[PDB]
């Protein structure tokens, strides 16, 4: 959903700082492909949307994850294939994807630093945030950072005023400490963008499936 606030900047030094965990997702469908985004949060784990993993039609092996992808011809951290899809049991567009190790028996959370999850104890409306991931209007597997403000927090719903584009499905929403406060899932044209807010209940689901999860 493209809004009056469309402040987007490409990221090139993708393997450094907090960008490293921001991941590009590619799923073939016989006619073409679908793409999306996610964020590495544990040794073998990314967070993304239910609607993203549902594109695999029940086979996790159809999902390729490229952490820190720079463009279609530059995956500096290679890829990791889907192994197990663990949907968040609650009523939000959130899933964990566990991935296999790569061809060098490296784990995804060893090649990049797993992202820091916010406890969201301090998160409030009007807060300045970024949503960073792989928009579909841009060239395949290019990373973009969008700047915006939180407008709504309720239940598992966090809405902001910044712009995103199909492919931004699954993009982490960062606070100023570069901690993940939520996971983008879509938007309502001319009104706001929407994300899964990482509330206490979501945090419990993360802890119960990702033993090493870093929540601060």
Author numbering: 67 to 282
Quote the study on this structure.
Staphylococcus epidermidis, a commensal of humans, secretes Esp protease to prevent Staphylococcus aureus biofilm formation and colonization. We show here that Esp cleaves autolysin (Atl)-derived murein hydrolases and prevents staphylococcal release of DNA, which serves as extracellular matrix in biofilms. The three-dimensional structure of Esp was revealed by x-ray crystallography and shown to be highly similar to that of S. aureus V8 (SspA). Iwase et al. reported that S. epidermidis Esp, a secreted serine protease, can disperse S. aureus biofilms.
Purified Esp was crystallized, and its three-dimensional structure was determined using x-ray crystallography. Esp displays a β-barrel fold assembled from two discrete domains and a C-terminal α-helix, similar to eukaryotic serine proteases of the chymotrypsin family. Each of the two Esp domains is comprised of six antiparallel β-strands, and the solvent-accessible catalytic and substrate binding sites are situated at the interface of the two domains. The distances between Nϵ of the Esp active site His117 and Oγ of Ser235 and between Nδ of His117 and Oδ of Asp159 are 2.8 and 2.6 Å, respectively. The conformation of Ser235-Asn234-Gly233-Gly232-Val231 peptide segment in Esp is rigid with conserved backbone angles, supporting the presence of a functional oxyanion hole. Compared with all other eukaryotic serine proteases, loops 3 and D are absent in Esp and V8, and their loops 1 and 2 are also considerably shorter.
